[PDB]
Design a protein around this ligand. Structure first.
Ligand code: SQ2
Ligand code: SQ2
Lengths: 305, 305
């Protein structure tokens, strides 16, 4: 027992990280088969940052301008292409450490692990959620661009995120591995509205189920509710609306605990209306929304990769 | 910016994990050079668990009774020895994936990353602290025994923890890699007192400095205190006493922020006496004590491995 904010083991991704340098700018790249993926803003200078003309900037570059280094080994760049906001550098060597992988565009409210890297070397790994407003609340310093987010299923790494930007508000924005930003964001040094965020209701409920499984019992009450009644409360507290699709994915946790989903909703309603009264759940004094129902079952059942 | 409960990249440790089977019991082992380390209770049955005579149980075992499997490869066991509560199985092959490593016995209040494994395969990685009472609050299911905790400095893995036991209270106990338990615990299925735990004061202060660095500003006040006055408050709230050695290791964070350590202590005093008033610090509604001052500087400066 016990419940932790657990990340995927990062070894398969560590072997794909490289350093990419174009002129003055060094960031991280992802080396998969014979292609290196990295943020296109590696080709900018500080003159460029307020609104770079990336097409014009890239036309001034040749294959030999992109320095790609994997540890101490230099890779030979034999082609380059810009796809949306990512650069794809073809190299003459396939990465011998390439895992089985896919590129996935995740949905808001899903979770993934981030391997934070600097100069192509790993610094740390942590778990986070894609917020409903398509930002992430990460831990990124200058030089972390090109660090990736991922999930692992069996032996397959699903890459879902590449880091590009810290907004002036201190939250983080990035792309899928085809270079399409999550959210309304563009790769320019500008104030950019992220828009209203909400709490991920289905994840809070999953975590309350995790709490019951691990022995935090105290928030269970004698009440139930309806999906309408609950969603009126969710709206007042800036929680995402709960749908039958969410009730369905909570099915396994409801069956394991014997607590019907709408009974758990009534416990969450009371917590929203009355607070925690100074008490804690799974070591937290707030309602946690960075565990999906899949995450809770995985951690409570010991799935390996 | 941003601050996350970050683990070390786990790849160097993933390549050392194996499965060890003795009779009916399967758990994890750590394969370093030509030795596999694992908890000695792999040799028990459920008859044995209330008070195993490990010397007698091991005398009934031979090298060929220990099945050690690294992925799909079987290792040949050519010797076995019991050191305190760990078994050391000499194998005829050195692990080609052995990193530079050392064995370290950590102090209470220090942090490390845990690679949770089942059947020799990694499941997840998370960061945690050794509690002042020498337990850890982990996430471990049956079959996780032999999972290890570690730190990484440059290219060297310092192994500090091997998982052995979940106490009836739901907290976790284990050994250093010489098999010596942290704390008063023994490897028997019995109720075992852990004794009073406390909050790790120097870590809370480090995290308050992390908060300031990242823009949580609101708990700073117009007050200061003394080490005596503060420690009277620490005692009342079951916080560890603060020493000049702790003030010294907080020096770098004090210099970066310009906030004297005793001024930060006065902010913490007010938080202990008055609570958070429904507000949050770095996404938490309680005072966080699982970041050391070294952790905060590392994450705020982007150290890689
Ligand atoms: C086009 C241009 C937009 C602005 N920008 C970034 O924000 C890069 N970045 N990303 N994460 C960061 C964390 C700390 C500091 C800088 C960070 C550079 C690229
Ligand atoms: C000597 C004997 C003591 C009791 N014991 C354990 O507690 C093993 N263990 N460790 N972590 C666990 C998490 C869930 C269930 C069991 C777990 C087995 C060995």
């Amino acid at each position: 027992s016990g419940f932790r904010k657990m990340a995927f083991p990062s070894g398969k991704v560590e072997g794909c990280m490289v350093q990419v340098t174009c002129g003055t700018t060094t960031l991280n790249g992802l080396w998969l088969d014979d292609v290196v993926y990295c943020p296109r803003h590696v080709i900018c200078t500080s003159e460029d940052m307020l609104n770079p003309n990336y097409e014009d900037l890239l036309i001034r570059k040749s294959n030999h301008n992109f320095l790609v280094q994997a540890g101490n080994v230099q890779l030979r760049v034999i082609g380059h292409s810009m796809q949306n906001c990512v650069l794809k550098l073809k190299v003459d060597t396939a990465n011998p450490k390439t895992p089985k992988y896919k590129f996935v565009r995740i949905q808001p409210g899903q979770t993934f692990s981030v391997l934070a890297c600097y100069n192509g070397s790993p610094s740390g790994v942590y778990q986070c959620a894609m917020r409903p407003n398509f930002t992430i609340k990460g831990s990124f310093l200058n030089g972390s661009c090109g660090s990736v987010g991922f999930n692992i299923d069996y032996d397959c790494v699903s890459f879902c995120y590449m880091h590009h930007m810290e907004l002036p508000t201190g939250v983080h924005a990035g792309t899928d591995l085809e270079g399409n930003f999550y959210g309304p964001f563009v790769d320019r040094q500008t104030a950019q509205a992220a828009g209203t965020d909400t709490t991920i209701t289905v994840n809070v409920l999953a975590w309350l189920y995790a709490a019951v499984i691990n022995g935090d019992r105290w928030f269970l009450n004698r009440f139930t509710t309806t999906l309408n009644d609950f969603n009126l409360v969710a709206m007042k507290y800036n929680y995402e609306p709960l749908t039958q699709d969410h009730v369905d994915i909570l099915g396994p946790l409801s069956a394991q605990t014997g607590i019907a989903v709408l009974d758990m909703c009534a416990s969450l309603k009371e917590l929203l209306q009355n607070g925690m009264n100074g008490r804690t759940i799974l070591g937290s004094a707030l309602l946690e929304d960075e565990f999906t129902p899949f995450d809770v079952v995985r951690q409570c059942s010991g799935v390996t990769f």
